[PDB]
Design a protein around this ligand. Structure first.
Ligand SMILES: [Mg+2]
Ligand SMILES: [Zn+2]
Ligand SMILES: [Zn+2]
Lengths: 105, 290, 193, 231, 62, 843
């Protein structure tokens, strides 16, 4: 959205002769240059995106209720890892408290 | 109990007794028999036909879509969204790879940017070329650009659809729709476009069924090696038009759909069949179903 | 367990039309069914000529084969709505006794013990989950059936067989002949052609 | 650029309106006080120390309605019809010069919003003074204008009317005096500390076609319900 | 257990027996029992129970 | 503060000698500390001593103004209104009393006399007050008359038997036995009209939490806010997202009703009218490039430009004063003609001050009820809208209506207080207002004296009001605050009725079936077996587990001040919305209010859980929940939380990890015997067989097991951070399993109720049959009451002979067995026992 400089209100976007013009309730009118060429957007599979589980994946090595697995961590050589299974495709991620995380992330 | 196969506590008997329409059926199914008796002997032939008839709308192949107020000219540098300004690199390749698909002269100030879900394109076995033909065959009032089909992870496949001016010349006499309204209406049409399937069915399985057949010696024998297609969701007319399905022996589980296309006498036989399925085998005599 | 190992290495590729989760659940349900061999140890522990429990089931007086197996061999997989125990305990845990994203089959309703040997606390909870459904559906089998029974009768009761063996509503034919044969359901014989 | 609070702008502004400087300094802090005490400056609250003090929002809200109304006059031509607070004084004007007033009237919103958001997070005490000082200097800017000749009388009237309404709006949130309580149109008049006429149903926990478990079309006696036992 | 009589306490409005053992009234031949008796063809039984034994009377219509 | 106590190493604990029968001592200790219905007595006691006095002295201040409807007189014609102002100062409740013969001196009323005579076991309530009457003249001056009223009895309040106000509390067991009472019963019921009534426990959603439900409305989010305490008034806000794209906030309370307001109007009325700042409270940053904020802003941007037919005039206005005035004239019920008061500037100031007083006291009161925390509420309100939009985006699922992580169990003290509020203002406050209205009509305000004012106050509260207050409470107790008659089938049924949790129940086919099932959050708190087996009530009634309890409200101020004094927690005023999402801070909640942020959510909960073990700093009944999905820490101390003791499991993972590091370091140096630097993993509980023998000897209780850091109380939402071994054998089986590190060890019998524990070898029986025994064991003939000859009861059976089963259970340590050890033959004999019949010996 575009915020009015004068009154900090949400300006109304209309389209005139091949240009996006924002007009406010206080009469201030501005035209967006490049960053306002986004009429609408949607994101699918929001329930299994990587940005969904960033906090949870970060906290997984410290949560005591997560399933562990007997595998060596290649960074700290700890002999156990934390195994999580996220998404409808059952993506398996192995995480450790040292910062190691399978899938290279 | 899951969606599309809800056969939990009384629902299907309620769908029959209340004469609920096909739109309100939570467990509609349909049995399709292959036209060629030789093909129904082989499971692989019936397996690929079953996967052929499965509604893959263009929406489910999309991870995210963006509606942009942009026009594309090959030479003139028009304004472009800063987060998507890198798209111009593969636009030049498209122009030099298709000397016949040049941009029109009536492209409107509306762009739809698409980022295909490459995982779904692999599991469903859908190529980029098939998607392009399906969209260009259904939407003549658009100009479509696409990136290269990449086999390397980390680089997505981008579909870019440009709305022509004729998209609003369809019906703009009804001035109760701003150009933003038509563009939103167009993208809904694009996403709901059918790709590689028939509408109304979400799953199509392969089952083994048993039938009788009179031999050349007049003997009636049970044939056990017969393959057919049992679908989730009902569309008699959709499977009617398919050339791989015998149209004469389409068995729906929907009374309303059978009534619509076959008549009241076939709907009478459909009510009898559907109640008997609910009744199980420890059910009433046949004369109570009539 | 080896289905889980295939999952860990990413060796489970679902077919067209199935997600990996739905294909994995299908594989687990198939892999956790008692074979027909389960009666070999059961029948070796009983004398069919003197076993009261077996003679009640074998002769059809009372009981069935899954009853003896549950009593003697094992309950097996608890399956509600043709699927395993879904995790309703805080995003991936079926109960407090099992960790998040547990892979073992016991965490999803597989009861390894029999009634004669006794169940553990997690197995009894899963058994109570399936046992409660029987009580709930029994209560619904009265009210829900009564709602459908009354509506069926009030629509059908006007149909009366007239002097032509037709079925009509006071003037209006519903059937040209009752049952299309004109016979009574109590007077039918099953005969081979 | 080093910003410093200027008390001379408030004194100059207060003298023009024939009001006490304490009235200007008490914007957003007039709630729960007698205007006579506010006029004398008695009982003034201490300077804010928290960034979540509602005074900072209260003063900032008064600033942006001065800017919102000033730009309405500045862009009067773009309106289908001007609002009430700017139309009765520009009515005698002609369209070609009503399309004007956006070139001869300077802008007064130069760097307020950016600085206020920085001062609020950094030091709330200075933010309250900055917003008050900005309102006074903006008023003096619109009051010290002298050229061209045809705009002086149309903007100085606007400057006094806007600052008076801002003060009056702040004044209408102070402690009321004495008045006839029956002018509202009813007999009873309750306060915000009254519980006699509270909603009875609101003492319970707030908030909340066929019943699947009800035997309503099953005609069975209530004394023989054991026939429905699962057994 | 219960078994009452050929006659007893009567509802003022409907003229039918009272409800249950507690009021010394009769027992209910409900909606589902008239369905069964009609299905069996027992119509003289319905007259005996629903009319002779419950509230049957004579109505005069011009 | 950091923990300082240290316990013995887990490798020296000898528990190899333990047995499951030894762990029954843990259940014995838990039941002995808890009691069986001790929560009922405690709830009624703190309702008597603390609840009703606070409710009367705080939440029933009366300030009203009435028109002077008299005739013509010098003072009369010149005055228009009189202000009635009063509050109650002294409140107390005494033991039940009865008047012997006539005009006696109120002798004591024993419970058996109340039962026999059909009387009411109610104790008198004495109140004192001060009243202020202010009359307003036309010229402008006013006259004030003030009077202090001596304490007097208004009515009688029902008294729970066995509580502090019962006569069977200053009596010995022998005296209780011989006065017609049951010496072995604990009590917990009310005597009214000769009947015994039980105020059942009520399921209720957790307050100060956001409940997000789907449904014209696309989505809905509810939030009931209570300013701290079981007896404080609660106000709910409903944030709806409509199909038109408009987000509306509706506040339902004692002052507003069903008025949906556009979401940004609430922000404007508190002084923050800039849209950029208003949006910032929801997205926490306008400069973030995250794809979530793009979805967030797109919905918010469209919501601002949706026209509301009711709030049309002030939708585009930025002057907060007129918005407050617009809402004040809309919600005030005494304004019948607009613009008649706008001419007077003092009436405008009156409605503005009244609306600000109401809103500060009613909009999210748990965040504060003063004008200082206005912006603080806006930050919290924006957070609530942010959470709701995360569910529309399908990032997070809607709130589970069945889980006990967001449910509370409210006893008799909370339920009776809620009914007391609606009855006290109707049967006491309203008659006083009517009494003073008629006093001022028949007499001039100046003619009144101190004597007349006191007379009018007491005369208005005649025995019509005294009958109204007591009998309305009895009607609430009888009609059912869900209550039921105490049917005395046997001792087991009486105890099971007092440990029963009832629900508010709707007609939705899926919703009516889901709530009748056993949920994954039940084991340990709600019996998984006990339910009705027949009819509509299957699963509608729930039973507390054998070790489950109901906690009371803690001293929240002690923990709140310590959290704010914690250097690891930054106060809410010291952190910005941009400082939260850019630095990844963790929001910290106490009883649902947001007090600050911490840089490490896991370390804060871990450090405060370890502090709770000592008990000297953090109370053992404090719930500490760490949400690993959104990185938040929650502290709960409110009443109504089910808790059970769980034995703490400790391990040596810190030493185990160091051995792994040393072994790896040795291998990197080329050493061959690098494996020799590893040590085995050991997880064990500190419960020794000697402790079990000390529990049985009475020298070791649950309180000092908690004080030694051996067991701790776990709450269903805190149980989501616990991995519990179902028995001491599963812990011993995984003693050296590093891939399964339990946090607690359970006693298997703790998952069943008292009635479900009667069935022997219940794990060997089909689980549906254990449910039947709960129903059948509660309707079993036996010694239904030890004081049967003193009672005149209806439809009660007293079986003469009872036997302890040859195979008894732990449930018979607390209730008397009911039945006989009949010799049973499992045989076919003549066909008379077919189809679930039996053949009985006549002898
Ligand atoms: Mg029965
Ligand atoms: Zn503006
Ligand atoms: Zn590591």
């Amino acid at each position: 959205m575009k915020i009015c400089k004068a009154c900090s209100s949400c300006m109304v976007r209309t389209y005139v002769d091949g240009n996006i013009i924002f007009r406010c309730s206080c009469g201030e009118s501005v035209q967006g240059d490049s960053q306002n060429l986004l009429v609408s957007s949607k994101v699918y599979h929001t329930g299994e995106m990587e940005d969904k589980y960033k906090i949870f994946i970060k906290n997984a090595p410290f949560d005591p209720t997560n399933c562990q697995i007997k595998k060596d961590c290649p960074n700290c050589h700890l002999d156990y890892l934390t195994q999580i299974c996220i998404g409808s495709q059952k993506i398996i991620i192995l995480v450790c408290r040292c910062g190691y995380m399978s899938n290279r992330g | 109990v899951a969606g599309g196969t809800n056969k939990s506590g009384i629902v299907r008997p309620q769908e029959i007794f209340s004469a609920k329409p096909v739109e309100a059926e939570q467990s509609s199914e349909m049995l399709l028999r292959l036209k060629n008796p030789e093909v129904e002997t082989n499971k692989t032939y019936a397996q690929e036909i079953a996967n052929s008839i499965e509604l893959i709308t263009f929406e489910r192949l999309i991870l995210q879509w963006h509606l942009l107020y942009e026009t594309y000219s090959s030479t003139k540098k028009n304004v472009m969204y800063p987060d998507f300004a890198s798209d111009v690199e593969w636009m030049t390749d498209f122009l030099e790879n298709h000397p016949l698909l040049q941009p029109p002269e009536d492209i409107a100030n509306w762009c739809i940017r698409l980022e295909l879900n490459k995982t779904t394109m692999i599991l469903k076995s859908i190529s980029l070329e098939s998607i392009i033909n399906s969209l260009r065959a259904k939407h003549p009032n658009t100009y479509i650009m696409h990136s290269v089909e990449n086999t390397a992870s980390g680089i997505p496949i981008i579909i870019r659809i440009y709305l022509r001016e004729s998209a609003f010349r369809r019906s703009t006499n009804t001035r109760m729709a701003t150009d933003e309204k038509i563009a939103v209406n167009v993208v809904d049409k694009l996403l709901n476009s059918t790709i590689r399937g028939i509408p109304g069915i979400k799953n199509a399985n392969v089952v083994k069924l048993m039938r009788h057949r009179v031999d050349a010696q007049g003997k009636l024998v049970r044939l056990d090696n017969i393959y057919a297609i049992k679908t989730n969701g009902t569309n008699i007319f959709g499977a009617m038009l398919d050339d791989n399905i015998d149209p004469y022996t389409i068995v729906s589980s929907s009374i309303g759909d059978t009534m619509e296309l076959y008549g009241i006498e076939a709907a009478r036989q459909k009510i009898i069949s559907e109640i008997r399925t609910v009744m199980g085998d420890k059910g009433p005599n046949h004369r109570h179903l009539l | 367990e080896e289905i889980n190992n295939r999952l860990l290495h990413g060796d489970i590729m679902p077919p067209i039309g199935l997600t990996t989760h739905d294909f994995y659940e299908k594989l687990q349900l198939n892999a956790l069914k008692f074979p027909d061999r389960i009666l070999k140890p059961i029948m070796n522990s009983i004398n069919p000529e003197t076993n009261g429990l077996f003679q009640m089931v074998a002769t059809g007086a009372k009981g069935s084969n899954p009853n003896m197996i549950h009593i003697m061999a094992g309950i097996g997989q608890i399956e509600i709505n043709t699927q395993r125990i879904q995790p309703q305990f805080s995003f991936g845990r079926t109960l407090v006794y099992y960790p998040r994203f547990a892979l073992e089959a016991q965490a999803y309703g597989f009861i390894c013990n029999s009634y004669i040997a006794g169940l553990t606390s997690p197995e009894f909870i899963f058994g109570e989950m399936n046992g409660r459904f029987d009580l709930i559906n029994k209560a619904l089998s009265t009210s829900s059936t009564g709602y459908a029974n009354r509506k069926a009768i009030f629509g059908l009761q006007s149909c009366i067989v007239d002097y032509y063996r037709r079925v009509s509503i006071d003037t209006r034919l519903v059937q040209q002949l009752y049952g299309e044969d004109g016979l009574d359901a109590r007077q039918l014989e099953t005969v081979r052609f | 650029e080093p910003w410093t609070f200027d008390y001379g702008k408030i004194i100059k502004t207060a003298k023009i309106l024939d009001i006490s400087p304490a009235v200007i300094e008490a914007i957003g802090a007039m709630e729960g006080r007698s205007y006579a005490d506010i006029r004398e400056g008695q009982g003034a609250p201490p300077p804010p120390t928290s960034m979540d003090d509602p005074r900072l929002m209260a003063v900032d809200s008064a600033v942006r309605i001065f800017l919102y109304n000033y730009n309405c006059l500045r862009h009067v031509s773009t309106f289908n019809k001007p609002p009430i607070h700017v139309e009765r004084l520009v009515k005698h004007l002609s369209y070609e010069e009503k399309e004007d007033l956006e070139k001869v009237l300077p802008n007064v919103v130069n760097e307020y919003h950016t600085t206020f958001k920085h001062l609020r997070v950094t030091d709330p005490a200075s933010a309250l003074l900055y917003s008050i000082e900005f309102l006074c200097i903006s008023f003096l800017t619109l009051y010290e204008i002298k050229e061209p000749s045809w705009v002086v009388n149309i903007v100085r009237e606007f400057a006094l009317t806007e600052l008076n309404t801002i003060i009056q709006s702040e004044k209408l949130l102070s402690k009321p005096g004495a008045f006839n309580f029956m002018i509202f149109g009813e007999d009873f008049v309750c306060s915000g500390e009254d519980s006699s006429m509270d909603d009875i149903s609101a003492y319970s926990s707030p908030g909340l076609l066929d019943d699947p478990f009800s035997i309503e079309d099953v005609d069975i006696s209530l004394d023989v319900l054991d026939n429905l036992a699962p057994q | 257990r219960y078994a009452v009589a050929s006659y007893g306490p009567t509802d003022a409005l409907t003229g039918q027996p009272l409800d249950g053992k507690r009021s010394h009234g009769g027992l209910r031949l409900g909606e589902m029992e008239h369905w069964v008796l009609t299905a069996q063809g027992a119509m003289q039984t319905i007259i005996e129970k629903s009319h002779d034994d419950s509230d049957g009377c004579i109505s005069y219509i011009c | 503060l950091r923990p300082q106590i240290t316990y013995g190493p887990i490798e020296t604990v000898d528990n190899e000698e333990l047995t499951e029968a030894d762990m029954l001592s843990f259940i014995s200790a838990a039941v002995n500390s808890t009691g069986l219905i001790g929560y009922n007595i405690k709830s009624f006691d703190d309702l008597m001593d603390n609840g009703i006095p606070q409710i009367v002295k705080q939440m029933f201040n009366v300030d009203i103004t009435y028109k002077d409807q008299r005739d013509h007189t010098e003072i009369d014609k010149l005055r228009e209104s009189v202000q009635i102002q009063f509050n109650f100062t002294d409140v107390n409740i005494e033991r039940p009393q009865h008047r012997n013969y006539s005009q006696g001196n109120k002798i004591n009323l024993l419970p058996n006399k109340a039962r026999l005579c059909g009387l009411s076991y109610s104790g008198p309530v004495n109140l004192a007050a001060e009243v202020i009457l202010t009359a307003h003249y036309s010229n402008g001056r006013q006259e004030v008359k003030r009077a202090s009223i001596p304490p007097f009895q208004v009515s009688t309040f029902p008294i729970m038997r066995g509580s502090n106000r019962c006569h069977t509390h200053h009596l010995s067991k022998t005296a209780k036995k011989e006065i017609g009472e049951d010496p072995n019963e604990p009590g917990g019921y009310f005597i009214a009209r000769g009947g015994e009534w039980v105020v059942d426990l009520l399921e209720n959603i957790r307050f100060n939490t956001l409940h997000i439900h789907y449904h014209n409305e696309i989505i809905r989010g509810e939030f009931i806010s209570q300013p701290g305490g079981a007896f404080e008034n609660s106000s709910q806000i409903i944030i709806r997202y409509m199909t038109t794209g408009a987000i509306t906030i509706e506040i339902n309370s004692t002052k507003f009703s069903k008025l949906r307001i556009p979401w940004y109007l609430i922000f404007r009325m508190f002084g923050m009218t800039g849209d950029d700042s208003i949006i910032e409270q929801v997205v926490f940053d306008l400069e973030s490039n995250s794809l979530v904020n793009t979805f967030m802003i797109e919905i918010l941007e469209k919501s601002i430009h949706v026209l509301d037919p009711i709030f049309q005039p002030v939708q585009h206005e930025l002057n907060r004063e007129k918005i407050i005035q617009f809402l004040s004239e809309k919600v005030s019920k005494f304004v019948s003609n607009p613009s008649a008061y706008k001419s007077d500037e003092n009436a405008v100031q009156y409605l503005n001050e009244r609306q600000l007083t109401i809103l500060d006291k009613i909009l999210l009161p748990h965040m504060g009820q003063t004008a200082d925390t206005r912006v603080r509420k806006l930050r919290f309100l924006g957070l609530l809208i942010h959470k709701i939009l995360l569910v529309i985006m399908n990032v997070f699922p809607p709130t589970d209506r069945d889980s006990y992580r967001t449910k509370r169990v409210h006893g008799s003290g909370v339920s009776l207080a809620k009914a007391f509020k609606a009855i006290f203002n109707t049967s006491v406050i309203a008659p006083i207002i009517n009494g003073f209205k008629e006093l001022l009509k028949q007499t001039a305000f100046e003619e009144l004296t101190q004597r007349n004012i006191i007379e009018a106050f007491s005369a208005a509260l005649s025995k019509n009001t005294a009958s109204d207050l007591n009998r309305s409470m009895e009607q609430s107790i009888i009609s059912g605050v869900s209550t039921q008659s105490l049917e005395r089938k046997n001792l087991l049924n009486t105890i099971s009725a007092l440990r029963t949790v009832n629900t508010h129940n709707s007609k939705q086919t899926e919703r009516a079936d889901m709530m009748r099932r056993v949920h994954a959050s039940y084991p340990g708190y709600i019996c998984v077996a006990q339910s009705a087996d027949t009819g509509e009530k299957v699963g509608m009634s729930k039973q507390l587990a054998i070790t489950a309890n109901v906690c009371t409200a803690g001293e929240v101020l002690s923990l709140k001040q310590r959290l704010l004094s914690d250097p690891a927690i930054q106060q809410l005023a010291d952190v910005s919305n941009k400082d939260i999402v850019r630095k990844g801070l963790a929001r910290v909640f106490i009883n649902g209010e947001w007090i600050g942020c911490c840089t490490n959510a896991f370390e804060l909960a871990q450090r405060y859980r370890m502090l709770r073990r000592e008990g000297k700093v953090v109370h053992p009944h404090t719930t500490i929940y760490w949400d690993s999905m959104v990185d938040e820490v929650e502290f709960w101390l409110d009443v109504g939380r089910l808790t059970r003791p769980l034995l703490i499991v400790d391990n040596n993972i810190e030493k185990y990890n160091q051995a792994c590091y040393k072994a790896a370091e040795a291998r990197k140096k080329g050493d061959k015997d690098w494996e020799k630097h590893k040590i085995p993993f050991i997880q064990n509980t500190r419960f020794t067989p000697q402790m079990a023998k000390d529990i049985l000897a009475g020298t070791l209780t649950l309180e000092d097991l908690v004080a030694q850091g051996i067991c701790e109380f776990i709450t269903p939402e805190e149980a989501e951070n616990c991995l519990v071994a179902f028995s001491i054998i599963e812990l011993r089986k995984h003693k050296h399993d590093v891939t399964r590190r339990f946090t607690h060890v359970d006693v298997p019998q703790a998952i069943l109720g008292l009635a479900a524990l009667v069935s022997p070898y219940a794990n060997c029986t089909q689980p549906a049959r254990v449910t039947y025994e709960t129903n059948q064991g509660r309707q079993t003939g036996g010694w239904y009451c030890f004081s049967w000859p003193y009672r005149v009861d209806m439809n009660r059976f007293f079986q003469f002979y009872n036997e302890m089963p040859l195979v008894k259970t732990i449930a018979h340590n607390y209730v008397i067995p009911n039945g006989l050890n009949t010799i049973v033959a499992y045989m076919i004999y003549g066909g008379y026992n077919q189809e679930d019949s039996v053949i009985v010996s006549q002898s």
